Amino acid sequence: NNWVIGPFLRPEGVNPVISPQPTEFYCPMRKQQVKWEESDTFNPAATVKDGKIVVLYRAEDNRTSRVGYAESKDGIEMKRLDNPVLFPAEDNFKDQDWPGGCEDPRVAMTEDGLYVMLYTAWNRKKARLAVATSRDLKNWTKHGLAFDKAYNGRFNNLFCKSGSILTKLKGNQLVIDKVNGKYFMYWGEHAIYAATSDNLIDWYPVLDEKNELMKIIQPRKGHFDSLLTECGPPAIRTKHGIVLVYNGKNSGKTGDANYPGNAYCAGQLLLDGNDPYKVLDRLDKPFFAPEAPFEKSGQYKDGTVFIEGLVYHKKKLYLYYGCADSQVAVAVCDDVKKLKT
Ligand SMILES: [Cl-]
Ligand SMILES: [Cl-]
């Protein structure tokens, strides 16, 4: 396991870094003041801008999901905005995100400074992968569903979520990186799939010889990833190939007894740097699992963690995750040599 990214250690006493608050904003959908982050602040994307770490967290009201913004000098202290930055609005995407909102963002940045967010649009009928862009991280422009166009709209009503764009470390920053002249992402919840794109907006799911969605990995009985194998933060190139950090949901009946039933633990998949569909290695045991009190609650007695943000900052990697389906926590890795390529 020389290729594994880590270890990620929880800084003592700092977690959780983002918790719910009764903060209000005027909702253009509900046309009234809404306590948009009163219930939970979790499943966070993370990125960097102007030397600062930015965490874009899923927030739920009393539900509708909206994305909040938090800014941090050191990756620990958070300065939050009173208004959410991505939410259902009076726009041309009501069919996609009214009334369930915008969930579970993952963010990556192009070398030219465009931040691309892959998130889930929820209309209470289908949860569907959507794309938003921004240059300042506060003003987001929706571009619709990731699979709206591809193959005569074949997957325009496919239930799907969790998009992890391929990135690499370039001169002090994680940037989006291409594969064979096209942009690339892993995606999925019940299996890990892939998709390509010319423009980061319209994505084309990779199909196999049977003209079916090609699964790279899927759940395994007896292991932590026994019910789901869900994309975590953006994938990252390393000396040994492409590493995808992913979240496994454990079955209490057919999973790994060493971990809690129905909880998520994090694994890693090593794929070939020349052939991103080719698996080279996969962790048998999770590299990050619920262990601390802040990752547990009444609903998740033994805890649960969901990894969704990964940033390189001052020669360290900061991992941001949803803890107990309700708060945001951070863990840090100071071993980054493997990222130089
Ligand atoms: Cl730890
Ligand atoms: Cl598999």
CATH top level label: Mainly Beta
The CATH homologous superfamily corresponds to Glycosyl hydrolase domain, family 43
Report the major sheet. 10 strands, mixed
Q: How helix-rich are the residues, as a percent range?
A: under 10%
Structural class category: mainly beta
- Based on the structure, what is the oligomeric state of the protein chains? monomer
Whole-number tally of structural domains: 1
| Count, helices | 2
> Which of globular, elongated, flat, extended, rod-shaped describes the shape?
globular
Termini gap = 18 Å
Radius of gyration: 18 Å
Give me the CATH fold name: Tachylectin-2, Chain A
> What compounds are bound to the protein?
chloride ion
Instruction: Supply the CATH architecture.
Output: 5 Propeller
> What is the tally of beta strands?
23
Helix and strand run: EEEEEEHEEEEHEEEEEEEEEEEEE
Strand content: 35-45%
